[PDB]
Amino acid sequence: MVLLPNRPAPEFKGQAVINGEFKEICLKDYRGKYVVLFFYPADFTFPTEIIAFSDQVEEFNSRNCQVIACSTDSQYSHLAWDNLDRKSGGLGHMKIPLLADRKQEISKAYGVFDEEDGNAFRGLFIIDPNGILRQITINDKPVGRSVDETLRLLDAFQFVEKH
Amino acid sequence: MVLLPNRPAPEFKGQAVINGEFKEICLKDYRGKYVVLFFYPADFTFVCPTEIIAFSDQVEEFNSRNCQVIACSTDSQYSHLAWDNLDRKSGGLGHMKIPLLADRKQEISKAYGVFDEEDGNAFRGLFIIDPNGILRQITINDKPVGRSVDETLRLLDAFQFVEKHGEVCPV
Amino acid sequence: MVLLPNRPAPEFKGQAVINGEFKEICLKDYRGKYVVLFFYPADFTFVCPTEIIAFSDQVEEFNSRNCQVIACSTDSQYSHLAWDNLDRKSGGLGHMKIPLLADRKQEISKAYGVFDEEDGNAFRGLFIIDPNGILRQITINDKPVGRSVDETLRLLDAFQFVEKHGEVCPVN
Amino acid sequence: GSTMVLLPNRPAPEFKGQAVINGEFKEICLKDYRGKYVVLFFYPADFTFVCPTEIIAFSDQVEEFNSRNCQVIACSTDSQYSHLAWDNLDRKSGGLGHMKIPLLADRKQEISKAYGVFDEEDGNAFRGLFIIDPNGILRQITINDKPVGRSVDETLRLLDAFQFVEKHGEVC
Amino acid sequence: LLPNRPAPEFKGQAVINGEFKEICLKDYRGKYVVLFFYPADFTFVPTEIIAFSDQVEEFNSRNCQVIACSTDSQYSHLAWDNLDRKSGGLGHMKIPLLADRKQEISKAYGVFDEEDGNAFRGLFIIDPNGILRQITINDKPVGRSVDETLRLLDAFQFVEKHGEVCPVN
Amino acid sequence: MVLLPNRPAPEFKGQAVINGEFKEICLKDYRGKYVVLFFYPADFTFVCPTEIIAFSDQVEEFNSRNCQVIACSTDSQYSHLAWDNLDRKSGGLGHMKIPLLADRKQEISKAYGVFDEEDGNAFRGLFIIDPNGILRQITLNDKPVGRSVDETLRLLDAFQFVEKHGEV
Amino acid sequence: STMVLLPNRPAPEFKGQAVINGEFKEICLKDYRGKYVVLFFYPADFTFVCPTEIIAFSDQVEEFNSRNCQVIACSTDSQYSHLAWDNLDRKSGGLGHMKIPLLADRKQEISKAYGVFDEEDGNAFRGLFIIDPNGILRQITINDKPVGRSVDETLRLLDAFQFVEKHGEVCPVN
Amino acid sequence: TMVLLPNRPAPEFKGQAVINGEFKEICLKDYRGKYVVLFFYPADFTFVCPTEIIAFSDQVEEFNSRNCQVIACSTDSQYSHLAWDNLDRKSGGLGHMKIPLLADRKQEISKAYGVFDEEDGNAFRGLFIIDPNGILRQITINDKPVGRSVDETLRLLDAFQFVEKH
Amino acid sequence: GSTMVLLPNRPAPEFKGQAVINGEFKEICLKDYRGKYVVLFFYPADFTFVCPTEIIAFSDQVEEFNSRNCQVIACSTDSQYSHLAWDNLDRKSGGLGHMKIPLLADRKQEISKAYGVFDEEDGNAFRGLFIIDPNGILRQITINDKPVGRSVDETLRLLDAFQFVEKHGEV
Amino acid sequence: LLPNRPAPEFKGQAVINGEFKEICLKDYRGKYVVLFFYPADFTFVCPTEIIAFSDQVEEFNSRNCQVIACSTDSQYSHLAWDNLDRKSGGLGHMKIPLLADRKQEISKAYGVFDEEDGNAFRGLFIIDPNGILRQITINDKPVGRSVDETLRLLDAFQFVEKHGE
Amino acid sequence: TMVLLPNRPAPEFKGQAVINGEFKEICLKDYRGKYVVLFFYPADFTFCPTEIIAFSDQVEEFNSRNCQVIACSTDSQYSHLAWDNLDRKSGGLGHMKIPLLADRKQEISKAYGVFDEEDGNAFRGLFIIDPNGILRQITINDKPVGRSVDETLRLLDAFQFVEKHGE
Amino acid sequence: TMVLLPNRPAPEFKGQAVINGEFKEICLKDYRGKYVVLFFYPADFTFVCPTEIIAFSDQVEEFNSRNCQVIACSTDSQYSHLAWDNLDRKSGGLGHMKIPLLADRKQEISKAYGVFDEEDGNAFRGLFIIDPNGILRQITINDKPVGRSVDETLRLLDAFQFVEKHG
C-alpha cells in the first residue's frame, strides 16, 4: 500500500516550469505514458546532479517515458536554476521537466521526506502507464543515482507487461 | 449500458473444466496474462461444432503471445465434461484445449451482461484483458452468427503495441 | 437498458454533414437499408483513422453490400466540415463519401452506451442495424487500438445471408 | 435559485479544464487569476463566428486588459484539440491565427452548464460575458442569443466602474 | 434563465402619467420590451434611471417600450414620480413604472436577492412574439448605459430581419 | 403550530427609522417593557393620516405606562424616511416620534403571519407584549379599518393591573 | 397549516345545537347571512372570573339590534352546563337571566376553526370575530384569558365596516 | 383495530378532581393497593333525573370496606363539576358527593379509554375495574338512555378479589 | 458538578409534591400557580423553631401577602407525614395550628437539589426565600444558613418593588 | 451556593480615597465582610441607595465589618465615576472602595455574572471574619438590595455566634 | 489555534456602539461594500501619546479614501457614553463622530484574538477589511505603544493599488 | 502557546543563516540583551519588487543606530538564498547584503508565529519585534503581493525603548 508495487500510487497535483514555462501538471495528466519521478533535497547542489538524464531524455523518447524531477523548492526556485546557464552555476537549458513541490505534500506521499533537513530524498519512482507503482529506488542524498540502469529496469517491466 | 473501457474487468471465478478433471480458477490468477473470454449459447447446440473449436487450435500461440482464451456458458459443469469427450465427428468438443467456464448461477453471463432475456441463453460476446485486470474490449454478435480469430488476434497484437509505444503512427 | 443485439435500435435524431452539406437525419429515414454507426474521438488531433481513411476509401464496399456508413462524434457540428476539408496530405480527411453525424447533444452516445463522462468525448463503438430496425453487431474498442474494415464487411454479409438464405450447416 | 440564474452577490462558479495558450497547452482552474480581474465569454461552435468581434476583437484589443489587471478567456463545448487547429487557421480564410487570450473549453459540458449558458437544443452554448473581481466574487451576468454579438467597450465601461468601486466606492 | 425561451407572464398595478393601470407582457405584444430592475424606490441619483427616461424617444422609433420595475409598490412609485427631482424624487418618467409587492416578478426572472427585499440590476429584452431575446445582469453598485441598450435592440433586430449574414463581417 | 395570544414571541430583526436615522434593532432591546406593535399596509397611501400619525400625537400615554409602540410594514428602508419627512398638509408622516421599522425580505411579516399572498402588502395589526418579552394581545382587521387609542390604552392598563393585582 | 388567519377569507362555518332564551335550538353562519355576526369566546362557566365582562354584551344587546348585529358567546363547556348557569341569580354569583345565543364547543370544530383553542388546557382564549352580511371575516380580537373585553370598542368596529362598506369602501375616513 | 384489553396496564390519567366541594390534584398510580372503579358519562347538567349517579354515592360506603374507590368523570371543567355539586338535590343538582368528580377538557383521558365519541364530543358510559397493581380488568360500555346496577359490579369485585385470593 | 449558577433571570426550577393544607392533603406543583406571585421559602426541618422561627409568624401574616396577590409556599425535605403531625398540634405545645399557607414535603430531595439549596453535608435544608412571578420567571433568590432568619416586612417590600417595575416603568 | 464551605477567594484592585490599591479577601480576615454587585457604572437610572451603603458605612465599621462593592466594570471606569459630583449624580460621592476585576473572575466565582448580558447581577454576601460563606442572596437586575435588610441579618449572626443556637 | 491570517474573511462580528451620543447596534455586513479599520485598546478614560484625541480630526482624510473608522474596548456601553460626553477639559471626548463600540461579553475580543485573560484586557489590535469582507492587515500593539494614523492611510492605499493594478 | 500575544515570550527559533556568502548558526537566545526584528517572505525570486528585502539591508544603519538586530527568513532552501544573493539587483537579485538570511525547511518558525500558510509553501510577509528580554512587542501581518514599511517599523521600535527608559 505504502511504497509498494502492483497497487495504486499516490496521485499528486504538480505546479512547475516546462522549457521555461510555468505549467500545471498532475499524475492524471501524464497518464498513459511511462512515468519516472525522482526527487532531490534542494536546487543548486554540487554525481549526476540531474545532468545526464536531461540530455539523455531522448532514450526515454525511444522508450516512451516521462522524466520528472521534483524538489521541495517552489517553481520560482526551479526557474532560476533553469535560465542561468551551466557556466554560471546553472544547468544551461532543460531537456526535461523540473517539478516544484513547495507544499511538501507529494514527497510525504512517497515517504521521501527527511524530518531532519526538511526536504525530499534521492528516492525515485518508476511507473508504467497504469497509475500503478512498479519499481522502487531510493538512494541517500549524498549518493548519486543510476542512469543506464534506470532505463534498463524500464525495458524489463516493459518486457514482462509484453510477455 | 454501464460498462466501458476505462472500467475494470469484473470478477467471475466459479467453476470450470481444465486438463481433465475439475480445477477451480480465478480471474485474479490470470493477472499480467492477457485474458480473452467469449460466451456460447449452449452445449450440444446444432448450429455448428466449429467456432468453439476455433479458439482451441490457436492456444499454443496465445500462450507464446502471453494470453489465454476462455469459453463460458450457463450450463452446469457435468455438461462441459460430457460435451468435451465427444469426438468432433460426433458433434462434440473432443477435448477442447481451453479452460471451459460453466456458470449455472447466471451471474457470469449477467455480470458481463451477455445473458439473454427472451430465452435463458447468452449472446456471444468477447472480452479481452490487459496485464493489470482492466477491460480493453467489448464485442457482441447475433445468435446465429459465429466469430473469427483473425479479429481477436489482430486486436490483441494492437493492445500490446499501445501499452509499449503509447500512440505512434500505423505499422 | 443494457444494449444487446437482436433488439430494437435506439432512434437517433441529429444534424450531420455529407458532401459538406447540411441535412437532418434520423434512423427512420434509412429504414430498410443496412446501416453502420461508429463513434470517434474529438476532431483535429492525433487519432486512430487508419480506420477512417480506409472506411472513406472503402465506402463502395458497403453500398455493394447495401449498407450505409455513418461517423458520429460529439464534436461541434461545424467542426466536422473543416475536418473533412483538411487535405489528406496534412493528415486531414480531405473529401469523403461518408456521412458524419453530430453527437454534440450526446443523447445518441448515451443512447448507444459508448458515451463516457470522463473526457467528454465518446469511445470507439461499432453498430449495425438491419432493414427491420434491429441492432446486429456491437464492437467496442479502446482509443489506442484500430479496426478492420474486413472483419466488419465479413460480419455484415453473414447477417444478410440469413435475412436471405436462412441457416446452413456450415459456419465460419 | 442559484442553479437557474447566477447572482451578483455570492461567489462565482469553479472550473478546471484544458486550454490553449500561445499555440501550446495549458491547465487553468481560475485560481491562478486570484487577485486579478477575470472576464469569461462564450460562443456556440468552432470555425463559425457571426461577427469577428467578441473573439478577435478582444484578442486584438487584449493590451487594454493587460493594463487593467484584467484577463479574458474563451469558453465553448468544442474540444481542446479543436481550438488548436482553429488557432492555426489564417485570417485570409476566416480562421483565428495569433491568440492573445486563453481559449479554455470543457468537453464535460460541466462549465457552461454551471454558468447557466447551456442548452438542450443546440448542445453548444450561448454567447455572453461574465466578470470576476480580483477576489473572484461574481460581478456581472450577460446572456444573449447566438446570432447577436458583444461589445468590447460595453465590457470596458463597467470595468472602469468595478475597479473604481473597490478603489473609491459610490460617492454620488 | 435563457434568451431563446419566452419570458413569463407578469401582471399588476403600474404608474403612467401618474395613473394606475395594469401591464402585461402581452399588452405589449408586437412592441419590443426592455424592462429593467433597480434596487429600490427613493434611491438617490449618475442618473442611471432618469437617463433612460431622457432617451425614451430613442426606443419607440425602434418599436421598443421601456419599463422600470422594483419590489416597491404603485403607491411608493407614484410618489417618487411626483417629485420635481430637483431634490430627491424622479419627475415624469415618460415610461411605465412597475411595482411588485409579491416580488414574484423578480423571482420570475431569477433576479431576486435573498438577503434583502430587492432584485439585482438586469436588462431583459423581449421580442414581439412574447418570446425573450436576451439577458443582462450586473452588480448593485455598478451603473448602466442607454447606448449599449440601443445597440442590443438593433442586433436582435438586424438578424431577426435582414438575417445573421455569417459571411465576411 | 397555532399562534396563541400568550406565547414567548418571535425573534424579529428589522430596520427601524428613528429621528431621521436608521438604527437596527431587536426584541431583547425592547425587553423589560410593553411593546405595542401595529402594522399599516404601506407608505404614501390614499387615506388614514390620522390612524398611523395618532400615536405620534400623544407618546406620553404609552411611555408613561412603560410602553413603547412600533410602526412596521413591507416597504423600502428608504421610502419610510421619505414619507416621514413628508407632512400632514400633503399626507406625510411629518416626523413620527416612534421608530419606523422596514420589512424588506419579508422575514418579520409572516413571522407574525400578517403577510398577504394575494396582494403582498401587510394586513393591519396590533400587538401587546409583556416586559418579559412574551406576547399578550393579538388584533387583526381588514386593510380599510383603523384603530382607536382609547382602546389600546385601556388594554394597556388591563395588563398593568393584572400582573400586579391578579384578578379580583 | 391553519396558522394565523388574515381576515379577508369567508369566516368559519359553525354547525351544532345551541342555547336560545332558555331552550335548545340549532344554528349556524349560513343562518345569519346579511347581518353582522359578533362572535366572542370565554374559557369557562360557573367560574370566579367577572361575569360583568360577559353580561356587558348581554344587556347591551339593545345596541346591535337596531344596529343590525347579533351577538354570540361560546366556550369549552356543554349546552346543558350552559342553561343552568344563566339560571343562577347574580346573588348566588350568576348571570342574572341574560338573553344571548349560547354555543358549545364539543367536537372542537368551532375552536380549531378560529385558532383560539389551547392544547395544554382546553379552555378557550378570549376571541372576537366580526362577520359582515356576506358571511366573511373582517376583524379579529383575541385577548388573554384574564383580560376582559368591552363593547365601546366593539360597536366602534361595527360603525367602521358599516360606514366603509356603505361608501368609500376603498378610501376610508379614520 | 387499535384496541384496549384487560389484564394489562391501565391508561394513565391525571387531573383536577372534586372532593367534598374542593379542587384536588390526583393521579391514577396514587391509588395503588386499591381497586379503582372509573365510570364515565356524556356530560354535566345533561341528566334530567340522574337517579343512577345519586345511587353510587349512597351505597358507596361498601366499596370502602372492600378497599375500592369509584370516580365519576366527564369532559366538563373542574368548574362544571363544582356548581352541580354545590347545587341542591331539589332541582338542578346531586348535592354532597361521596365520590370524586374528575374533570378533563383535554379529553385524552377518554380517548385513552376509548369511551370517547366522535358524534357529540362526549364519551359513553364506561366502567373500568383496576387492581392495586393498576391493571385493567373489567371493561363495561353502555348506553346514554340506560342506567346501571350497583349490585352487579359488586358481585364482580367480589369475584375479582376472590380470583386473586385463591 | 459546580455549584448551581442559577439567577433571577431565567425560568425558575419546577417542583411537585404532596402538600399538607387545612389539615388535609393536596398535590401542589409550580404549574398550578399562574396569575399569582409565588414565595417559596425553605428550611432545615420540622419540629425545630430554634431562635428564628417564622413558621407561626408567617401564618398570621397571610393578610399582607394576599393584599399583594401572593401565594406563599412552605417547603423542606421532611415528610408530609411529619408535616401532618405538626399541623394538628397546638401552639400551646409548641406546635403550629391551622395553617394559612400550604406545607410542602420534598422527600426524594429532588426539588431541593434543583435549587442548589440542598445540603449534602447533612440531610436538613437551608432557609430559602424566592419570588416567582405569575409568568413563571424568577424575580428573587435568598438563602440563609440555619441559625439566621428571614424578614417578613422585607419580602412584603420585595413585591411592590418587582411589581412596580412591571407597571409604571423600570429603565 | 452551599452557604457552608468558606467563601471563594476574590482578588484585585479597588478604589481607596482617590487612589488605587490592591486588596485581598484574606486581608479582611478577622473582620466581617459584606460584598455586593451591580450591572455597571455611570448609570443615573439605577437606585441611588448604592451610596446609602457608603454613607452609613460607619455603622458597619463599629459593627466590625467592611463592605466591598464589585462589578464587571473596569478599575479605570470606576475611577471617573467616583470623581463625578452629585450635581451630575452618576456616583454621587462614596467612601466605600470600588473593587474591579477586568477578568470577570470574582463575579463568576459567585456565578452571578451571566451570558445574556456580559455582566453580573446585584448580589449580597455576608461573610464572617474567618472568610466562611454564611449568607447568599441575589437580586434581579432592576431591584436593589436593602440597607436595613443587610443590618438585620448581620445582627442575627453574632447572636448565634456568641450566645449559641 | 494560532494568530489570524489575512487572506481569509474577517470573522462575523456585531454589537452596540455609540454614535452622536446614541446606542446603535451594528454589524460588519452593515459596513460591507466599503472599507473598515477596526482597532481596540485596554479600556476607556485613558491618558499612546494621543489616539482618539487624534482620530476625531483625521477622520475626513480617512473618509476621502472611503473608510469607516471604528473603535472597540472591552468596556461597558455606558463607560463609552460617559467618556465621550464629558468635555475634553475635564477628561471627556467632546463630540466623537467615531462610533464607540463596547464589549461586555468580550465576544469580539476573543473573536480577533487580541484579548488577554491575564490583564483582563485586550491588546491594541488593528484590522483592515476590504468591501468584500476579506481581511488585509493586522497590527497588534501593546498598551504602551500605539499606532500611526498617517500610516493607516498608506497601508489602505497599499492593497488598493494591488487590487486595482495588481501591481 | 496557541494564540500569540505581545505580552507572551517570543517563540524560539534556530536554523541556517546567510552572512557574507557563508553559512552561520544562530538562535534568538543568543540575541538576548538587544532588540530583534523578524520579517518573512514567500520565496526567492518573487515578483512585483526587487526591493522589498533590499530595503532592510540598505537600512541596516537604521536598526543599528537604535541598537536592534534584524533577521530575514523564508520557507526557502539555505541554498536558494546563495543563488538569489549573487544575482544582481539589475539582474533581478541583490548581490550585496547585510541582514542574515535564515532558511526554514522545517517550517517550525513560520508556523510557530502563525505566518506559515496552509494552502502552500509560500509564507505571509510578517514582522516581529523582540525586546532584549525575549518578550514579544508587536505583530504586523501583510500579504504576499503587498509590501511593508521601513519607517513604520522604526516607529514602534523606537517607542518600545521609549518606555524602557522613560517609562
TrEMBL record, chain H:
Cross-referenced PROSITE patterns: THIOREDOXIN_2 (PS51352)
Signal peptide start-end: none
Catalytic residue list: 49
InterPro entries: AhpC/TSA, Peroxiredoxin, Peroxiredoxin_AhpC-typ, Peroxiredoxin_C, Thioredoxin-like_sf, Thioredoxin_domain
UniProt key word Disulfide bond: yes
Record-stated family: Belongs to the peroxiredoxin family. AhpC/Prx1 subfamily.
Official protein name in the record: Thioredoxin peroxidase
Species: Schistosoma mansoni
Automatic annotation (TrEMBL), chain K:
UniProt-listed GO biological process terms: cell redox homeostasis; cellular response to stress; hydrogen peroxide catabolic process; response to oxidative stress
Gene Ontology MF terms: identical protein binding; thioredoxin peroxidase activity
PROSITE patterns (UniProt xref): THIOREDOXIN_2
Gene3D superfamilies tied to this protein: Glutaredoxin
Top-tier EC class: oxidoreductase
UniProt catalytic activity: a hydroperoxide + [thioredoxin]-dithiol = an alcohol + [thioredoxin]-disulfide + H2O
InterPro entries membership: AhpC/TSA, Peroxiredoxin, Peroxiredoxin_AhpC-typ, Peroxiredoxin_C, Thioredoxin-like_sf, Thioredoxin_domain
Active site: 48 (cysteine sulfenic acid (-soh) intermediate)
GO annotation, cellular component aspect: cytosol
Keywords of this entry: Antioxidant, Disulfide bond, Oxidoreductase, Peroxidase, Plasmid, Redox-active center
Residue ranges of domain Thioredoxin in the record: 4-161
Pfam families: 1-cysPrx_C, AhpC-TSA
Documented EC number(s): 1.11.1.24
Function (record text): Thiol-specific peroxidase that catalyzes the reduction of hydrogen peroxide and organic hydroperoxides to water and alcohols, respectively.
Entry similarity comment: Belongs to the peroxiredoxin family. AhpC/Prx1 subfamily.
Protein name per UniProt: Thioredoxin peroxidase
Organism: Schistosoma mansoni (Blood fluke)
Gene name in the database record: TPx-1
